[PDB]
């Protein structure tokens, strides 16, 4: 004797809980590739998915995409086009204060729908990174004069007295300026910098494609676990967090947001693009140099926390960011959420479900058992 | 002092339960390679093993083998020979409705023991895939006129309003037509499509050899876990499920069925065969193109959920399907079951036992510690 | 304030149990490489270690080494020299009954301390494999006439009516003949064949270096778990068990015995030796063919459960078996046991301790972080 | 409604415990790469970090670095420069007693801040290894006459009657001489040698880069677990322990100390340096031979417990040890500890937190997803 098909939806009530795991059940020491999001119910087109995201307490973007402050990723060209496509760029500071201020000016003075713009002047939004030593106070002053919208305090370990004092000084001196503090990977770190007055947090330590901090400092955290534990705390204070490092595809972006991130920062993915700094070279493939700011070369302009490498040409971000945007829309559709806001609410309520992945399951999830294969878009 | 050998069978009663794990104990997020079935008692020849399998509520096959609806796997030639060998083929729809209807006609009009045939006309059984948009209503009408026996609603995420409405429309318009809905990987998805009136379910998301949905959508499920959790629900309603994706050998077929699948769908395994579409080419090995329907090439005839690749020549299925058939018989024999029906009953009663496999155990289970090696059959 | 060194031994009493895990605590689905034995106390030289081992109820060897019944491992030459070095050889049956009987005769008629010899005639001990069909009754009769000491019922799944009847027939017809039944990997299998009257058991399914039974039959068990669970049962009846398959080094032998095996069977390790059948060939390395009896080539003299491969030349066993013997002595010394009998007693009492090994720990345990490396003995 | 940022630090009290795991919670069978230390609070410069370390009960070094007693690592040249840089060298004994005594004399007679020197004569500290057989009594006498400061009883399994008697003999004969016993990996081993009168312990079995003891003896322990369980016992008696083997980078040193080690011993890392014995050779890379003392070559001057290999040129330790020193300072800074003494106290109190690392997390922690990459310092 079999059950009547008409009672199929009702019979779900006989189960203790929904299939798969809630986020809390899921979250030891795992990262993005160690799990999946289970599909939900589709009753809308992907084009309907809204990807509006909080960068800081006062700044909201139309897309959760942020380009990393690295000298092989983000200068004026990257910051301009990232802003035009609904994200934002963080200009690096491996350069003179004069040079950095000039790059900010190029972004703010640029003229030509989802574009990231200031509410008042309708100029493109621009971010910039700085250190937390005394000399950077002057550097920031020059950046602010150039029209800086948001500053990122750049550090591998942001929970320091130096950064705390810098944050306090900025809020007091430049109250209209949004401050993103970091990097952090623990609840205690986040509380410290939130208490200091941070407008946003940057999450990650060692997860970068070119980073080896975990190998030389023995210090860091798996990215997935870091994002979850930090945001679970920080979101209670309305402090948006950037998931920074270890993002290589659309799936990582979805998972980063699922675990509590408001935006995601990318370095390696955008490194090979036309708009990134540095020239192309052949090896017979078209490559661009991509290096950690803690590498000997970058610091040269000593203990290295990063390495110098190369990545394949990815083409222009004018096609690559839309690919990520459309992809994330389709990802949200499969999960059954119409916005990142809804996605956040559904996850915390336990409606969105997750599943672990054994090493075998991970291999199964990718390409396998082929003689050869070639195309993301 | 040692125990008397005569009391050996009786002494088993002193143990709390049988050696190894029941299926429920076994079932986180694992797939086929993560476990094994423990051997049982052999008191019959392998030739006695019956492999009769339910494809849908009303359709039963002599073998649990289904060829996937892909343009590099199943057209008329594949569907004909699959049917002749006791399975069935699902004709792809990456073509005009006219072209697809012609391929169905070729199968139904073909003339020449275990063969899959309609009960009334004794014509070869034929399956076909369609989308769930309005234009497909017309396409299905043409397929039905050509003598279609079963339709597969083709989607990576089948739990949508569009597919639900399509299922309702088909049952109402073509009541004699069997409908397989999918793809699904969760209990909630299955309930939705069963409630809609599905005659069978297609299980899998991201597990395909050419699929990368898990990588770009962050959405899917390990195949083993998906089959178990879906069928544990669906079998209560007498809805047979196809285990689709990640099958590479006879062992995967056995495990798929063990975990609750009624039939298994194969794409990559049948791709390199003579009866599959596409021509052979040399690279110095004989290869055939095998590509996901979500690949840029297939869609071309945009976010790719599949990749284009190649597989080695496997020869004719006239020898390959019998190899799978005989192999599965021997597999059932080792386990100690005389049919797939008995296999299903024994597993759910806890008589058939399972065992996890550590990564070391998996390497041990395959070929290892040789300088070189060569032959499945 | 620190503790007095004089109280160091006494302070161990404050701990709930000894460091590491007992065997029961250790024993899911793991195999040899997944764990280690913890060192004990050395108060004796390695030369004092006795490696006497039970092959069957009535046969004891001076070394726990058995050569596998494969046509690329054991014929007369191997069986003779294995016996001379304190082990035993099992002659394969991929040949006519006449040919097999001749090989046994060569062993028993051979004339020239730890040597394995019959108690009465002082002839070298000899084993031989047979099938369990009717034709093998005649074959066994010819082997017995040639002076066979022990017969191995050769099968990948030994728990069958055919093997059970064969065992009953042999005990009744040739009461003086020792019977080793198998292969088995579960408690239920062992009870069945012990109840039938087996004098020893052969443990393993899929763990062989050339075996792929787990891949095609989905049936088998990780070797470590199989040895433990079978012997934990079988040893209660005084039935010695051979750990067959997956042995590649001295460490595997120690672990096999630790988990309850009385002897270990080797195929791949002895395949490349001078005394094995088959000629050497160059590829620029000296190799010998090594193949599973379930391979197409071996069966040829169809579903393959084994593959044909090659192994590097290992030299003569006149140097290789002493290497294993001395190595196992040193292994026992490190653990702090003076015999395999003591080793068995110490393990079951919980005195010998074990430790799991993460994948990282396994890599650490081998050679790592070198530019290159070369020598077992 | 969001929480007030001012209450961020106070809100931490609502959590049951600190983020991450205490060391006890962390500690199955894992090693260094299986975990990380979570970052703390920085309120000091790295230059302030003190790395003073106990080698034995009476000997303290300014740096926790010890060069291993291997004939491809430490002779007079290495021992001199290790001492000059605040560590110590252990001269190997794969040589005549006369030759070893001469090497010690070269170190003690050498003349030319953090340098490791005797308190009385201000001569460079020098260590030396010996065996535990009768002939070594004479050898030690010659070493002591040459001015030996500390002796290491060299063995893969130090818990033996021979070593116990040697320790007793040395304390009685040369009371002023510091004795390091080992190697050990269990609590029971440590208690035995502490009770015998050891002044320090050497931890490790099989973890060496050139060691294969675990593979051939089946005996050993994952290094991380060994260090923790041994030191948790030994530190109660004020017996410093050397973490010996498996150290490849600064991160391993930090973790070794975190788990309870007082100093770390390095062989492979220092093998390729200018000051190590053996000449350079090209293969087109500059290499030096590095081999285990249990290798056939080393023993030659038989069952091998080590292998012969090669490592890349690392340059002079005059630059490499400062790199490790500065790196470890920065590591301590990130964790938020001002000394190794504080680091030890903070870990045992549960203030320093840890995190597991899945295989995915480990890959993420290193370099990944690059076309190519190059520089530690
Ligand atoms: C450690 N972390 C470093 C370094 N340079 C940059 N970064 C960090 O990694 C992120 C990039 O990660 P991807 O996976 O490439 O996207 C950056 O945003 C930054 O957080 C370094 O040298 N050492
Ligand atoms: C995701 N899944 C895809 C795609 N093309 C086909 N398929 C799915 O995979 C199965 C084939 O799996 P194999 O392991 O090759 O046998 C198909 O039956 C279908 O379910 C794709 O582009 N993206
Ligand atoms: C499955 N098992 C097979 C086959 N030929 C031999 N054997 C089994 O494996 C053992 C050898 O294992 P090694 O790891 O090489 O020492 C044999 O003793 C036997 O039990 C086969 O074709 N399929
Ligand atoms: C086992 N252990 C051996 C052998 N030679 C040296 N050693 C051990 O390994 C340590 C070196 O480890 P690395 O990872 O290279 O730094 C030595 O200090 C010693 O404890 C051997 O032949 N077999």
From TrEMBL, chains A, B, C, D:
GMP 1 binds at residues 46, 160, 162, 330, 333. Its EC number is 1.1.1.205. Mycophenolic acid (MPA) is a non-competitive inhibitor that prevents formation of the closed enzyme conformation by binding to the same site as the amobile flap. In contrast, mizoribine monophosphate (MZP) is a competitive inhibitor that induces the closed conformation. MPA is a potent inhibitor of mammalian IMPDHs but a poor inhibitor of the bacterial enzymes. MZP is a more potent inhibitor of bacterial IMPDH. NAD(+) binds at residues 154-156, 204-206. GDP 1 binds at residue 112. It is found in: Cytoplasm. Keywords: ATP-binding, CBS domain, Cytoplasm, GMP biosynthesis, Metal-binding, NAD, Nucleotide-binding, Oxidoreductase, Potassium, Purine biosynthesis. GO terms for cellular component: cytoplasm. This is Inosine-5'-monophosphate dehydrogenase. It catalyses: IMP + NAD(+) + H2O = XMP + NADH + H(+). The active site is at residue 211. CDD domains: CBS_pair_IMPDH, IMPDH. IMP binds at residues 68, 202, 209, 244-246, 267-268, 290-294, 305. K(+) binds at residues 206, 208, 211, 360. Belongs to the IMPDH/GMPR family. GMP 2 binds at residues 68, 183, 202, 209, 211, 213, 244, 246, 267-268, 290, 293-294, 305. One of its GO terms (biological process) is GTP biosynthetic process. SUPFAM superfamilies: CBS-domain pair, Inosine monophosphate dehydrogenase (IMPDH). GDP 2 binds at residues 112, 117. Pathway: Purine metabolism; XMP biosynthesis via de novo pathway; XMP from IMP: step 1/1. Its cofactor is K(+). Signal peptide: none annotated. Catalyzes the conversion of inosine 5'-phosphate (IMP) to xanthosine 5'-phosphate (XMP), the first committed and rate-limiting step in the de novo synthesis of guanine nucleotides, and therefore plays an important role in the regulation of cell growth.
């Amino acid at each position: 004797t079999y059950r009547d098909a008409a009672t199929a939806l009702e019979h779900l009530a006989t189960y203790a809980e929904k299939d798969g795991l809630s986020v809390e059940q899921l979250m030891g020491g795992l990262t993005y590739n160690d799990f999946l999001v289970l599909p939900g119910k589709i009753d809308f087109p992907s084009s309907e998915v809204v990807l509006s995201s909080r960068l800081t307490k006062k700044i909201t973007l139309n897309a959760p995409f942020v380009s990393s402050p690295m000298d092989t990723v983000t200068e004026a060209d990257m910051a301009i086009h990232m802003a035009l496509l609904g994200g934002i760029g963080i200009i690096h500071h491996n350069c003179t204060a004069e040079e950095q201020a000039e790059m900010v000016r190029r972004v703010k003075k640029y003229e030509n729908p989802l574009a990231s713009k200031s509410a008042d002047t309708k100029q493109l939004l621009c971010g910039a990174a700085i250190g937390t030593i005394d000399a950077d106070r002057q550097r920031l002053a020059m950046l602010v004069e150039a029209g800086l919208d948001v500053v990122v305090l750049d550090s591998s370990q942001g929970n320091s007295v130096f950064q705390i004092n810098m944050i306090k000084w900025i809020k007091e001196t430049f109250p209209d300026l949004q401050v993103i503090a970091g990097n952090v990977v623990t609840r205690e770190q986040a509380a410290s910098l939130i208490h200091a007055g941070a407008d946003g947090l940057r999450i990650g330590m060692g997860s970068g494609s070119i980073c080896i901090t975990q190998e030389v400092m023995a210090c860091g955290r798996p990215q997935g676990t870091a994002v979850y534990n930090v945001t679970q705390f920080a979101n209670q204070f309305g402090v948006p967090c950037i998931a920074d490092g270890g993002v290589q595809n659309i799936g990582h972006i979805t998972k980063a947001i699922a675990l509590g991130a408001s935006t995601v920062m990318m370095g390696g993915m955008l490194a090979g693009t036309t708009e990134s700094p540095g020239e192309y070279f052949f090896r017979g493939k078209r490559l661009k140099t991509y290096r950690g700011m803690g590498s000997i070369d970058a610091m040269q302009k000593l203990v290295a926390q990063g390495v110098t490498g190369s990545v394949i040409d990815k083409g222009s971000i004018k096609k690559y960011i839309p690919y990520l945007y459309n992809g994330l829309q389709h990802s949200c559709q499969d999960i059954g959420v119409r916005s990142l806001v809804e996605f956040r609410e559904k996850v915390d309520s336990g409606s969105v479900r997750f599943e672990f992945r054994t090493p075998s399951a991970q291999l199964e999830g990718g390409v396998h058992n082929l003689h050869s294969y070639e195309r993301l878009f």
